[PDB]
Design a protein around this nucleic acid. Structure first.
Ligand code: BGC
Ligand code: BGC
Lengths: 207, 207
DNA sequence: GCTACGATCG
DNA sequence: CGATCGGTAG
DNA sequence: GCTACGATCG
DNA sequence: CGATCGGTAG
């Protein structure tokens, strides 16, 4: 059904105006691939790792993380993460601060302090903001990324994203890099598929 | 001695490169006027009020604040502020959130929870960041503004300031609005007078 | 060969 | 405040 | 006549 | 997440 969702999203975006129709046509079908099968602790750690880093840099770090902490080159279990000292994690490429935060997330998972996937699925984005922000290292941007790339939510507009703001400036022909609320206002017509709208804006550099 | 300080600062900035020399020449003498005579609670409230607002908008609000809470059109005392309900403060132009934060600051002053001016004068900017950030509504930007406009510190670079970032993009000929650390790096040569350098960049729009 | 591009800590 | 992890495009 | 331009809260 | 106080330049 993700296919039907993307088709509906693409049709909606193409109905907004000339610029959206043109962008969707040039970029082609949305190929965004979320991974809801991932447990919350994994999705959260993947989101934290991506903070301030490009996809390529993030992937290189996660790859080393899996090779170091896992036995079957898979994503490390909470236990395996706790059995790895922060210095070893840092050696994988995580900043020292992220190394500490990842340890805390693993421990929270082991102690059942993180909401279950079942609970998270019933929570609105606003409720997720209130709940997950209680985790050290996890705030607005990280929760938006977890919502898009792990949960697969379709109407998330990461208006605070620097890259998206730069792309919105070009796309909307603005005289200056927009503030967060300005991006929120400009992309309102994209509802209820703002995640897909964000994805299309993120593809502009590739063009 | 503030005059000798500004003269020294202007001479230093003019010794960096062509662009700084030219900017200082075009803008003229630095006319920044700090107000260290203001008590910490006043400087902090003035800084909070200025959050996200232009100087003109900020002044209009403070003007109403003084007329409403003071008896002699002067800046309200901590007691006078506490005697004013948050709804009345909101009517002066303060956002509802700022109204609550200003009440908290006034109460902190009455309860001697804010460091004394004497202590603040002995604290480094880093120490002020650690100390004053414990106040609701007061974080990095606000502390930088308090340091510049109230304390009169000369080497404060508010690298996180949106306006300054926009001006730095133009001044340094950057292809994109710079990130905070980029502004920090680009203005390093301005030490030990980065407050004055920031002031000159803030004058670019006037030109 | 060289630069720039989340959220937390004293 | 002023740093932080890194692949890669300009 | 009309738009845009810190830090906190459920 | 998605708002928030307002004078004023474009
Ligand atoms: O990390 C998630 C996303 O963050 C954005 O800032 C980057 O521009 C995207 O390419 C990346 O997929
Ligand atoms: O509020 C203090 C300063 O904040 C900056 O963002 C504005 O551009 C300055 O004009 C103002 O004086």
């Amino acid at each position: 059904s993700k296919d039907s969702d993307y088709k509906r999203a693409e049709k909606h975006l193409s109905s907004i105006d000339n610029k959206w129709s043109s962008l969707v046509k040039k970029v082609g079908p949305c190929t965004l691939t979320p991974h809801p099968e991932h447990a919350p602790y994994e999705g959260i750690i993947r989101a934290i790792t991506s903070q301030k880093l490009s996809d390529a840099a993030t992937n290189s770090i996660i790859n080393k993380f899996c090779t170091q902490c896992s036995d079957n080159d898979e994503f490390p279990t909470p236990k395996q993460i706790m059995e790895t000292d922060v210095e070893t994690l840092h050696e994988c490429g995580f900043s020292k601060l992220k190394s500490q935060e990842i340890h805390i997330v693993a421990e929270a998972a082991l102690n059942k302090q993180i909401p279950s996937k079942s609970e998270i699925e019933k929570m609105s984005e606003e409720e997720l903001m209130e709940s997950l922000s209680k985790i050290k290292g996890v705030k607005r941007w990280t929760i938006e990324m977890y919502s898009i790339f792990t949960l697969g939510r379709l109407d998330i507009m990461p208006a605070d994203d620097s890259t998206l703001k730069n792309e919105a400036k070009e796309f909307f022909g603005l005289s200056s890099k927009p503030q967060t609320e300005e991006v929120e206002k400009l992309t309102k017509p994209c509802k209820p598929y703002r995640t897909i709208a964000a994805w299309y804006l993120w593809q502009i550099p590739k063009l």
